[PDB]
Each structure stands twice: as structure tokens, then as C-alpha cells.
Design a protein around this ligand. Structure first.
Ligand code: NPO
Length: 338
């Protein structure tokens, strides 16, 4: 009952913000630009500093014209509407959002420890206890999101930041969506796609549990289970129902992964009658104190090295390009709700 009541309150609070989203809560000239932290085909993420408070933030900047071109309008509206409505210890906090003639802006807490991807590639692989510490946080986060009828759809190490306590902050809600029943959009990242996405089915939250299997495998092995030079070859492996496990994997790890990387979505852990509890009660998680993880009382396997809240050392170097704002409004109608 404690979990039922927690999730009922969580959904109540989400729905209130979902139905009445915040809008236009800052503007660009309230911030100083510090550094480009990452780039994409329709936007970038910048470290900025608020000029009055001195607080640092990560600012995601999306070019409205490129969003339309890349057919991401609904996705960008989902992303902001969801992020402004959620509240969970392992989800990045959106502090402000606004738009101007050219761009959409989402201003989030800055996490100087950087992406799990960098740390994983530096160390090679994580031990099972280390992978399990992160996996537990994802399990709780998906239990939260799924209860709110949200599917995340982009789990991968690049979207998981490691904070000053060594805990995960899930960022990048660009593919997240509120879904009752099924959804159909082809999206995600190739190595992490469930078979039913590849096969163009109407799919559900089970795709997030598949992706958790991929992430746990990658954390514990150092590489993902389905790898190839071309996406088409990745997709053939994903749909095949065959995965090879390193000999160093524990038997409990292999068993959990066979049930998450289950090609038949109707047999996949997280999507059965017992829902998330088939995962939480699995032997691989026997040492996990779920409440202690939620309360952030477990000492983390490691804390990233950083010098302070403005340190960018754990992010990489990108060409610094202008943030141009047109004299004329672009795509006003498409982004009215933002
Ligand atoms: O906002 N975002 O989508 C982000 C932010 C930071 C990061 O490292 C990756 C993605």
C-alpha cells in the first residue's frame, strides 16, 4: 500500500502540472553563455550562468525550423510538457523554459559529473554491484514514469548524468511520450531498440524494459549486446533472439538479461502481470535496498572528479557556434503551446 499511495500522489501531482503547463518563465538575456556541452542535428546543449543569481544551468536550444524539417514538432512539445510536470530523484529538473523568434529553450539543472557513457568508456566496464546501483535507479524511475502513463524511449548511457553524489540524473526527454496503450513512432537509438519498434508494431512501455536489458548488458560488459557497422545489421541481431554473454557475467545477471532481452514482448520482464516486481524481486537485485536507493542513502560506487558547479572537464569540446535569433518569428503556429 505504501507504493500504491506513493504512486497515486505522484500521478496526482504530475497531472496537475500536465494539464496546466508552465510557459515563458525566463528569457535568453538573463543568462551568460559559458560552453557548448553537446550538439545535435536540430539543437545543442550549453552551459549557461544566470546573471542575477550566479547559478549554472544546462540550456538545451532547439532550432524551430530544423525541428519542423526533422519532423520532431510533437516530440519537442512532449519533451517540454513532460519535463515541466515530473518530479523524481533521478530525473533532471527543468527550471525554466521559453522561446523566441528562432529557438526553443529548456533550462535545466547542470550536472558537472558528465555522462555515464564517458565514465563507462574510461573504466572499460562496471562491476556487477556498480551496474546494479545504476540499474536500480532506472528501475525506480521507469516504475514512476510508467505509472504516469509515460514511456521514456531513449535509455542509453549518454542520457544518464552522474551527479555530485554519484547518482543518476536521466536527461533527454526528446522521445518521451504520454501513452495509454500503444504508440507507433520509429524513434530511439539503434543499439537500444526493441524488436517491436524495428518491426513497426504498435508498442508499449515494454520497450523501456528491453532497453534496460541493453543498458545493463553494456554497463557490465563494456559494449552493447547487439553491435554492428550498419544499423541494418544491428536490427537483424536484435530481432534474432540470440545474445552471447561474457563468461564473467554471473548466472543471476544472465537470467535477468534473458528476461529483459526477451524478443516476445508478452513474455518480457516489466510487461507481465506482476509488472516491475518481477524485476525488483529477481535474484540479481537481492542485495538492493530499494527504499535506501530512492532516499539516496546508499554510498555510490564512485563520485565524478570535478572542481565545482561550473566545471566542464567531464564534457568534451565542440566548435562554439552563434545562437542567432531572427528578426522575424519562425514557425509560430507550430510551437504555440511551448
Ligand atoms: O538536455 N539534454 O538532452 C541533455 C543534456 C545533457 C546531456 O549530457 C545530454 C543531453
Amino acid at each position: 500500500e505504501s507504493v500504491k499511495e506513493f504512486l497515486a500522489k505522484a500521478k496526482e501531482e504530475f497531472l496537475k502540472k500536465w494539464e496546466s503547463p508552465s510557459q515563458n518563465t525566463a528569457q535568453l538575456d538573463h543568462f551568460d553563455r559559458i560552453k557548448t556541452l553537446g550538439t545535435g542535428s536540430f539543437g545543442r546543449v550549453m552551459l549557461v550562468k544566470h546573471k542575477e543569481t550566479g547559478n549554472h544551468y544546462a540550456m538545451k536550444i532547439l532550432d524551430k525550423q530544423k525541428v519542423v524539417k526533422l519532423k520532431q514538432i510533437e516530440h519537442t512539445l512532449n519533451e517540454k510538457r513532460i519535463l515541466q510536470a515530473v518530479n523524481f530523484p533521478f530525473l533532471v529538473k527543468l527550471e525554466f523554459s521559453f522561446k523566441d523568434n528562432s529557438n526553443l529553450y529548456m533550462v535545466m539543472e547542470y550536472v558537472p559529473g558528465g555522462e555515464m557513457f564517458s565514465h563507462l568508456r574510461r573504466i572499460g566496464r562496471f562491476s556487477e554491484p556498480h551496474a546494479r546501483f545504476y540499474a536500480a535507479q532506472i528501475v525506480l524511475t521507469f516504475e514512476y514514469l510508467h505509472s504516469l502513463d509515460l514511456i521514456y524511449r531513449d535509455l542509453k548511457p549518454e542520457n544518464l548524468l552522474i551527479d555530485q553524489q554519484g547518482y543518476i540524473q536521466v536527461t533527454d526527454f526528446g522521445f518521451a511520450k504520454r501513452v495509454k496503450g500503444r504508440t507507433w513512432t520509429l524513434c530511439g537509438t539503434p543499439e537500444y531498440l526493441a524488436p517491436e519498434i524495428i518491426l513497426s508494431k504498435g508498442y508499449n512501455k515494454a520497450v523501456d524494459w528491453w532497453a534496460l536489458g541493453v543498458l545493463i548488458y553494456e554497463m557490465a560488459a563494456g559494449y552493447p549486446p547487439f553491435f554492428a557497422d550498419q544499423p541494418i545489421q544491428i536490427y537483424e541481431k536484435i530481432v534474432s533472439g540470440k545474445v552471447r554473454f561474457p563468461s564473467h557475467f554471473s548466472s543471476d545477471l544472465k537470467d535477468l538479461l534473458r528476461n529483459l532481452l526477451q524478443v516476445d514482448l508478452t513474455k518480457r520482464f516489466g510487461n507481465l502481470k506482476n509488472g516491475v516486481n518481477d524485476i525488483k524481486n529477481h535474484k540479481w537485485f537481492a542485495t538492493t535496498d530499494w527504499i535506501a536507493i530512492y532516499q539516496r542513502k546508499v554510498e555510490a560506487p564512485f563520485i565524478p572528479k570535478f572542481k565545482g558547479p561550473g566545471d566542464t572537464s567531464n564534457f568534451d569540446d565542440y566548435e562554439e557556434e552563434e545562437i542567432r535569433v531572427s528578426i522575424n518569428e519562425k514557425c509560430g503556429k507550430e510551437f504555440t503551446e511551448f
